[PDB]
Design an enzyme around this catalytic site. Structure first.
Site, PDB file in Angstrom:
ATOM      1  N   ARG A 148      25.958  27.622   1.702  1.00 47.79           N
ATOM      2  CA  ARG A 148      26.177  26.281   1.200  1.00 47.79           C
ATOM      3  C   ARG A 148      27.237  25.488   1.942  1.00 47.79           C
ATOM      4  NH1 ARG A 148      26.608  25.943  -4.921  1.00 47.79           N
ATOM      5  NH2 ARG A 148      25.495  23.956  -4.595  1.00 47.79           N
ATOM      6  N   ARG A 195       0.833  -1.203   0.000  1.00 44.73           N
ATOM      7  CA  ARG A 195       0.000   0.000   0.000  1.00 44.73           C
ATOM      8  C   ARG A 195       0.875   1.263   0.000  1.00 44.73           C
ATOM      9  NH1 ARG A 195      -5.021  -2.321   0.794  1.00 44.73           N
ATOM     10  NH2 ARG A 195      -6.010  -0.297   0.332  1.00 44.73           N
ATOM     11  N   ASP A 230       7.313  -1.249  11.918  1.00 42.17           N
ATOM     12  CA  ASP A 230       6.429  -0.220  11.392  1.00 42.17           C
ATOM     13  C   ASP A 230       5.549   0.450  12.420  1.00 42.17           C
ATOM     14  OD1 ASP A 230       4.498  -2.065  11.992  1.00 42.17           O
ATOM     15  OD2 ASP A 230       3.697  -2.225   9.940  1.00 42.17           O
ATOM     16  N   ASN A 241       1.104   1.421   7.281  1.00 41.32           N
ATOM     17  CA  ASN A 241       0.928   0.574   6.114  1.00 41.32           C
ATOM     18  C   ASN A 241       0.835   1.352   4.836  1.00 41.32           C
ATOM     19  OD1 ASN A 241       0.854  -2.029   7.414  1.00 41.32           O
ATOM     20  ND2 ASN A 241      -1.129  -1.358   8.274  1.00 41.32           N
TER      21      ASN A 241
END
Ligand SMILES: [Ca+2]
Ligand SMILES: [Ca+2]
Ligand SMILES: [Ca+2]
Ligand SMILES: [Ca+2]
Lengths: 440, 440, 440
Positions: free
Chosen positions: B325, B14, B101, B220
């Site tokens: 930078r 997903r 997760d 997910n």
């Protein structure tokens, strides 16, 4: 079989605007257009929009696919829908009556609204919703729609309210209105009066309840307009996330309704994408990036920059603080650094303009290098001119290239130079004075 | 005594990404790393991460402190944890099984999870939470974890759900799995099946309930990824506020997990701080400021500017719209104004570059003044060069300093000049043409 | 008849600041000033602010309209209000006692608080509110204000809490305090003790309940300070929306409390308006725009730019990325493009400076054109100079205008030129070298 009537006649004085209320934008298009798009979901055989003040204005843009009717006199919703009589009178089927100021209602809900209508053979079905603060809204008793004032100490407790969206059997709808209007004993008549007539006649009146109350939002002022943009923003960003686009903060990213974004794109907060903009795969968009009516390819990195009506190829790096103006095209792997402005110019692949540079009306080749501070001049006061810069040219820092002029392939310009004449291929143009020191 | 198993094997379709799911970042580091950090709180004697697709990739970065095991075949969570058998088989103690997760779970909750485990001598304890919308989640009856489908019209009402985080007695855990796998009559087996086995055997199964349900979030798709960034952002900003940092809008300020910020710093909305960034006391950061892997001292004011891999001393003022930078250093009380780019240069204290200037590869002294429009040139096409600018030098507006070259202390450059040769101390270098008027 | 006592004595150690707590700003002004503004709504005959640490500092700004009293010793709220004895002792009427750290309370609530006070002839009325998490707050039983610790397993359930804002009959207030202080048997005494005394004496004690609990917020740390800015931001933006201003995202737009904005103005997200700023009708402000102590006319478009202490006429277009610095004035229909800095200069109508330009200390006429890259130089090292540019002058791209100098009406400067001497009207000044090519 399905007909639609869109109520879009002014009267929105809380907006404090001279623009017809329904023309105020939400995520890139007017509220009226969001309503047309939801309405299309019922596939109406005919659609009629009742307009009023600044009537042509509303037509002067979102016209074409829809019949318009003007009402020079404002006598209520009943009167407004009565203005569509000349076109819907007699036809059989189902007629959706909806306001042009409820831009959050979805096509899926309209559809569920009709299905319910038919599944109960109702004569009229009121799209309703439930809120814990029914104050003001008309209450649903289905028997009758009791208003806030005409409500009994008891009725003022009904959680279910009237959204002002309805489905009527077309034949009976115009009948009841025709009737009420003559025996009204009043000037203005409301569409909710028809619900009153079907009550008298004992006709069937159903009510479809929306799952989400917030989708019923009617916009009457700018506070509700902001609420509409908030819901629409969340909806748009949600769909992009399900589709593979990463958002650092989807509650603070502003993407118009028709913007297309390929999966794997990464978007930092506070990015703005407007109009017909399209973003290619794996592109990264950083905070402050603002893109309008442009195409960005895959693998690009846009850092805090503004891009308008232009095209950007794959692998381009822009920013921070660059401005790509209308009708510019940046070829593959081009690099535009900080404080660079590109206007109406095509730029070949791998070319680099890393600092404080202005490139206007030029055709530039590939592998060109613009040193910091380079300025193109193509304006005299009344007329503009073009400049051609070949492939592999090196344009020294702080130069001034005055158009019309051309630089041939592999040529070179020395820093601090002012170019007024063509520079042939492989040549070297210098137009700077000599340095003179002075002890003490 | 404490062991940890981290489930990090692909299958996240997903996400619509080619990157292993657990490698997607949240506030600066991968979800996997947030899980390792929470896991460290239980001080596990051993930690094992089950990886899968792009296995090396997950190892090619967040490696070192952890043992990895690959699963070439995806047969469920039971199988995944079975892959750690070669390393945890036989040892006694407590084993935490957690997914890579669920980046929001905290070390404090893991700890409360174990304590509870031991305080009840359970054989297995399920980390649970309560939500008013249990739809989809496995229900907690402790007797058994009923799934959504296998749930009875009654059971589908249990508010308490399974987070997929568990603590098992290491000895019995591998036993049950070894068993189920052979008499499974199926290919894939889930870790929740072990909870089924302890039910048969009548073994003790507890459940720790989390106070905050949102900390149980499993990512997910990209919608949940954004939700994770939202919670993590609030957590990070909360800690900074308790520590004395002021935020105009902590819901819209983006600070990575390892950024350090001294008390009394003031941060306007929409500021971005990434990587190993550090901010000194009383520094003010305004809207649009973007800092990456840099150090900013005390008393500085960064106005809408971008600073990357650099060091900024105390009292420096930068912006608006300046770009510092990589590998630059700005000394005490230096001032960089609008549209200035500093790249790979050291700049001594009190030096000023207030407008439209590009300073690259230079060593600059103290008390130097760069007039608006000054450009350093240290690129020829293939090679770069350095420039040395002494103390108290004045570099006139719109000059071009072409490297390699050196300007001695107290020297001066006249405006509009192009410098190609060293300028001795106290000297005055001029390289501009003469002005010529023309009547009418 | 109405008197007010504002408690503003330090002790705010959770703020981690050296500034007196009440001096921290919320939407442009200190918390103390928001409290003075709410207090004015009761039209108090006399107002007294009890200060402490850095006493003068609090006076060194928000002074004038209010009497101050210092407390060198911190012995509680009772003691603090006792310090106003020398001024309120004996007078009859009603006395409001309020903390300088509750900036969200409105004048309308203070007023409803007094009305209630009188409408019940109470001796003292406690401003209260209801929350579902009373933990910590003093509970309201009216009988007595039970503290969290001195609360019974039962009392710890009272939803209604004490906000620390009170109204007392002035005569009895100083009596009870005078009493408690001597027979206190302790050093410090709290103002809530007086509520205890009226309980003993059986005097009437009422309680006004606020409708919105969030308005009772007391700021003790920077987390609550951010919450205060969040509520104040919503309040300010709400009023602007009701007044006709459109906001793309009012939850992420930062407008100070005294900024004035005409109806029909459109504001994109992330815009910042500070101080005495004023915005004319139909002006558009885009993302990133930052305006401080400036006036913007009607019909202007400010695109991502910074404007400080300046005045901008009708129809001006600024940006993106321009910086208008202190004491500048832009005439009608002037255009300042990207990367332009205007400092201390007046600019006549219709003048254009579209790119990479620096204009400082100049008086510029109308219809002037600044080509990209033009730099004015009016700094030598110790002294500044002014430049006068007449009407209809054309200043070629990449020029350097060195002050003091003057350009007469309709004169013209060639690109790449360095101007050091006056240029007479209708003349043409050129100061650039000649270009020399070189084959191969
Ligand atoms: Ca070619
Ligand atoms: Ca030195
Ligand atoms: Ca004049
Ligand atoms: Ca220049």
């Amino acid at each position: 079989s399905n007909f639609a009537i869109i109520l879009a006649a002014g009267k929105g004085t809380r907006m404090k605007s001279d623009l017809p209320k329904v023309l105020h934008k939400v995520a890139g298009i007017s509220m009226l257009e969001h309503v047309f798009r939801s309405v299309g979901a019922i596939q109406p055989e005919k659609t009629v929009t009742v307009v009023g003040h600044k009537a042509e204005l509303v037509e002067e843009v979102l016209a074409g696919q829809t019949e318009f009717v003007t009402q020079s006199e404002q006598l209520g919703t009943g009167h407004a829908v009565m203005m569509t009589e000349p076109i819907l009178e007699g036809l059989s089927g189902h007629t959706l009556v909806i306001a042009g100021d409820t831009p959050l209602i979805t096509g899926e809900s309209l559809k569920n609204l009709i299905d319910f209508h038919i599944n109960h053979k109702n004569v009229a079905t009121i799209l309703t919703a439930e809120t814990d603060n029914p104050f003001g809204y008309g209450r649903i008793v289905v028997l009758r729609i009791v208003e806030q004032k005409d409500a009994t100490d008891f009725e003022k407790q009904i959680k279910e309210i009237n959204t002002g969206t309805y489905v009527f059997d077309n034949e009976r709808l115009f009948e009841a209105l025709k009737n009420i209007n003559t025996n009204n004993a009043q000037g203005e008549y409301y569409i909710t009066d028809v619900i009153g007539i079907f009550r008298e006649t004992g006709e069937k009146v159903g009510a479809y309840t929306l799952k989400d109350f917030d989708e019923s939002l009617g916009v009457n002022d700018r506070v509700a307009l902001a609420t509409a943009e908030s819901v629409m923003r969340r909806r748009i960003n949600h769909k992009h996330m399900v589709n593979g686009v990463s958002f650092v903060n989807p509650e603070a990213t502003y993407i118009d309704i028709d913007v297309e974004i390929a999966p794997e794109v990464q978007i930092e907060a506070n990015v703005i994408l407007k109009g017909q903009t399209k973003i290619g795969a794996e592109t990264v968009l950083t905070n402050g990036t603002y893109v309008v009516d442009s195409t960005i390819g895959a693998g690009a990195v846009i850092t805090n920059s503004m891009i308008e009506e232009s095209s950007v190829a794959d692998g381009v790096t822009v920013g921070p603080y660059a401005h790509i103006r209308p009708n510019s095209s940046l070829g593959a792997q081009v690099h535009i650094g900080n404080f660079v402005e590109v206007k109406g110019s095509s730029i070949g692949e791998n070319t680099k303009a890393g600092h404080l540079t202005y490139i206007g009306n030029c055709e530039v080749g590939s592998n060109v290098n613009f040193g910091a501070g380079t300025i193109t001049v193509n304006y005299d006061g009344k007329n503009k001119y073009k400049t051609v810069i070949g492939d592999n040219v090196f344009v020294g820092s702080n130069s001034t290239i005055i158009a019309p002029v051309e630089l041939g392939d592999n040529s070179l310009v020395g820093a601090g130079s002012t170019i007024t004449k063509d520079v042939p291929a492989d040549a070297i143009a210098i137009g700077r004075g000599r340095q003179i020191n002075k002890d003490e």
